[PDB]
Amino acid sequence: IRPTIGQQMETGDQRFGDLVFRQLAPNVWQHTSYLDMPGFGAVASNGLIVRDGGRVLVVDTAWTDDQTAQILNWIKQEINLPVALAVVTHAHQDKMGGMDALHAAGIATYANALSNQLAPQEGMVAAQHSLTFAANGWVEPATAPNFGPLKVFYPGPGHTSDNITVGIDGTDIAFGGCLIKDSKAKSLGNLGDADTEHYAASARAFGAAFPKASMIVMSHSAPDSRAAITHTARMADKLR
Amino acid sequence: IRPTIGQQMETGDQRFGDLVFRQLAPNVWQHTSYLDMPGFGAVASNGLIVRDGGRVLVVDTAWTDDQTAQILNWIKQEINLPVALAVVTHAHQDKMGGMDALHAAGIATYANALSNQLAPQEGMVAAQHSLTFAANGWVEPATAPNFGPLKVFYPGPGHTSDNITVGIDGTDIAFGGCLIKDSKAKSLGNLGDADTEHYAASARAFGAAFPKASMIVMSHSAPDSRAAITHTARMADKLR
Ligand SMILES: CC1(C)S[C@H]([C@H](NC(=O)[C@H](N)c2ccc(O)cc2)C(=O)O)N[C@H]1C(=O)O
Ligand SMILES: CC1(C)S[C@H]([C@H](NC(=O)[C@H](N)c2ccc(O)cc2)C(=O)O)N[C@H]1C(=O)O
Ligand SMILES: [Zn+2]
Ligand SMILES: [Zn+2]
Ligand SMILES: [Zn+2]
Ligand SMILES: [Zn+2]
Ligand SMILES: [Zn+2]
C-alpha cells in the first residue's frame, strides 16, 4: 500500500491482488510486489513484463512464490499469452524469491551462472539455465536463445558480484535492477554484498551499454531519467 | 632471498636471476617472484609451470613483466619446449602483473571473463581469451580448448569475486592461488576485495572439486597438505 522503501502508488497504477502494475510502453509493463516486515512496514520491488512475438518474457520474480503466481495470473487476465521465459537479475529475495512458482508453471528460467552458483547460499532456488558473459559484459548469445528484444548485459560487480541488467531493443527502456538507484536517492541501499571498489564503474558501464534509453527502470523507485545512472555513479564514487 | 611474506628458500630451490624455482613433480614446477616493498621487504608470489608432452603450460604471471620474462627464460633453459598457453587466476598484480611479457612472447592467455572485465579497473592488461563457468564452478570446456591436464574450477567468491583455481590432472597437485592460505597462517591476507560472506563455502568448494589432491599449492606459502584448505575455511567461518 504505502511502502517504507520503494515508490508510492501514483496515477497510471493498476492494483491486482497484492501487486501493482504500470504500463510503460505498448508492450512493456512494470510489476511491483511488497514485502511487509513487522514493525518496519512494506518494501516494494519492481520487475518487468514484456510482450514479444506472441509470448511474454518476465524480468525478475516477486518477493514470494505466491506473489509471483499472482503476476502470472495478471498476465493471463490482461495479456493472455504464454509466458516463455524469465530472466532474474541476481540471487536475492526481491529478484529470485518466486522461482518455484515460475518452475511449477512450466516457465524456462535464466540467470547469470554466478547467480545460480550463489543461489543456495543466498536462500534462493537456482534458475534452470545459466547465462554467461563476454569480457565486455554482453551475454554470450548461445546461452540466451530466443530472447526476442531482451539485451542482457553484465556491468560488473556493484550491488552484488552477480548483478545483471536488461535493455529492451526497440523501446526507450533499460532495467538496472538493484544496481541503479533513483536520481534523488540518498544512499545506495543494502551494501552488505556490494563491491564498493567497482560499483561506480559498473553503474557507468550499464549507462554505456544502453546509451539510448531514456527510461531507466529499477528495483526500488519509479522509472527515472538517465540522471539515475549519473547519480548512482557519483554516489558510488564516494565509496572508493 | 628472504621474503617478509612468503616461504623462505629450502633445499631443492633453484635461484634463477631474481626468481626461485622448485620442482614439485616430474612435470610440475613452482615459480616464485618477489615484489620489494619500500621499508617492508619482499613479498613472494607463486605460480606453476607444467610440462604436457612437447609443450609447457603456465599458471599465473610474476608480479612484473621483467620477472615474467625471466620465467620464460628459465623454461627455455631448463625445459626447452614452447609455452602453449597461460592461465591467470584473478585480476591482481601478483597473478596478472606480467601479462605483457606473455603477449610479447606470443603465448595465448586465458582468464575468467570477470577477471578480464576487471583488469582495466585493476591496472592490469586483460588476457586474450575468456573462460566461463557453470553454475557448479566447472569451466565450460569449449572456453578452455586443449588445456591438457589443467582442470580449471571457479569455487565462488572469496579472496576476490573472480578468483579461480586449477587442478593438475595426472598428479596429486591442486592450485588455490590467493584464495587458500597455509595451514599455519594466522590471517586470510588482503580482504579488501574479498567476499566475507561466501569465502568459507568457496574454500570448501575448492577442496571438494579436487578431493584427492594431497599437495595444495598457493600464492604466498610453500606447498602444503589439505589442512591448508580446511584451515582457510575455518578462518573464513569467523568472517560470517
Ligand atoms: C531494498 C534493499 C535494501 S533489500 C534487497 C535485498 N535483500 C533482500 O532481498 C533480503 N531478503 C531482505 C531481508 C530482510 C528484509 O527486511 C528485506 C529484504 C538486498 O540485500 O540486496 N535489495 C536492497 C537494495 O536493492 O538495496
Ligand atoms: C599477499 C597479499 C596480501 S597482497 C596480494 C594482492 N595485492 C597486490 O597484488 C597489490 N598490488 C599490492 C599492493 C601493495 C602491496 O604492498 C603489495 C601488493 C591482493 O590485493 O590480493 N595478494 C594478497 C593475498 O594473497 O592475500
Ligand atoms: Zn540484492
Ligand atoms: Zn533490491
Ligand atoms: Zn549475501
Ligand atoms: Zn588478489
Ligand atoms: Zn596474493
Q: How many CA atoms lie within 13 A of B130 on its CB side?
A: 20
Ion ligand 3, residue ranges at CB < 5 A: A 92, 178
Domain that holds residue A228: 1-240
Q: Which residue of A has its CA nearest to B134?
A: A113
Q: Residues within 5 Å of ion ligand 7 by Cβ?
A: B 94, 178, 219
Taking a C-beta distance cutoff of 8 angstroms, is the pair A28, A49 a contact?
yes
Residue to test with chain B: of A92, A115, A124, A132, most B Cβ within 10 A: A132
What is the 3-class SS of chain A, one letter each residue? CCCCECCCCCCCEEEECCEEEEEEECCEEEEEEEEEECCCEEEEEEEEEEEECCEEEEECCCCCHHHHHHHHHHHHHHCCCCEEEEEECCCCHHHHCCHHHHHHCCCEEEEEHHHHHHCHHHCCCCCCEEECECCCCEECHHHCCCCCCEEEECCCCCCCCCCCEEEECCCCEEECCCCCCCCCCCCCCCCCCCCCCCHHHHHHHHHHHCCCCCEEECCCCCCECCHHHHHHHHHHHCCC
- Is A177:A60 a contact under the CB 8 Å cutoff? yes
Q: Could you tell me which chain B residue has the CA closest to the CA of A110?
A: B135
Is the Cβ atom of B216 under 6 angstroms away from ligand 2?
no
3-state secondary structure of B28: strand
Distance (Å, rounded) from C-alpha A159 to C-alpha B18? 41
Residue B117 has its nearest CB partner, among A113, A130, A135, at: A135
Instruction: Find, among A128, A198, A89, the residue nearest to B121 by Cα.
Output: A198
- Look at B136 and A117 and tell me if their CB atoms are within 8 Å: yes
Tell how far the Cα of A159 is from the centroid of ligand 3, in angstroms. 6
The residue behind cell 513487522 is: A38
Rounded to the nearest whole angstrom, what is the distance from the C-alpha of residue B218 to the centroid of ligand 2? 14
Name the one residue in this structure whose C-alpha cell is 550491488: A159
**CATH number, position B91:** 3.60.15.10
CB pair distance less than 8 Å for A201 and B121: yes
Set of chain B residues whose Cβ sits within 8 Å of the Cβ of A121 = 156, 197-198, 201
Using the Cα atoms of residue A215, residue A221, residue A222 and residue A228 in order, give the sign of their dihedral: negative
* Cβ-Cβ contacts under 8 Å for B192 (sequence gap 6 or more): A197
Please tell me the residue having the least CA distance from ligand 2 atom 23.
Answer: B190
* CA–CA dist A114, B113 (Å, integer): 12
Output the CA A219–ligand 4 centroid distance in Å. 6
- Answer for the pair A198, A149: CB distance below 8 angstroms, yes or no: no
CA distance B134 to chain A (A): 6
The candidate with the shortest Cα–Cα distance to A209, out of B125, B92, B117, is B117
Solved how? X-ray
Contact A130 B135 (CB under 8 A): yes
Q: Which atom of ligand 2 is nearest the CA belonging to B90?
A: 21
**Residue B43 near ligand 2, beta carbon < 6 Å:** yes
Task: From the CA of A37, give the closest atom in ligand 1.
Answer: 16
Residues B191/B147, Cβ–Cβ less than 8 Å: no
Cross-sheet strand order for the sheet of B83-88: B13-16, B19-25, B28-37, B41-52, B55-59, B83-88, B108-112, B129-131
Chain A contacts of B117, Cβ < 8 Å? 133, 135-137, 154, 156
Counting from 1 in the atom list of ligand 1, the atom nearest the Cα of A40 is: 16
CA of A217 to the centre of ligand 4 (A): 12
Total domains, chain A:
1
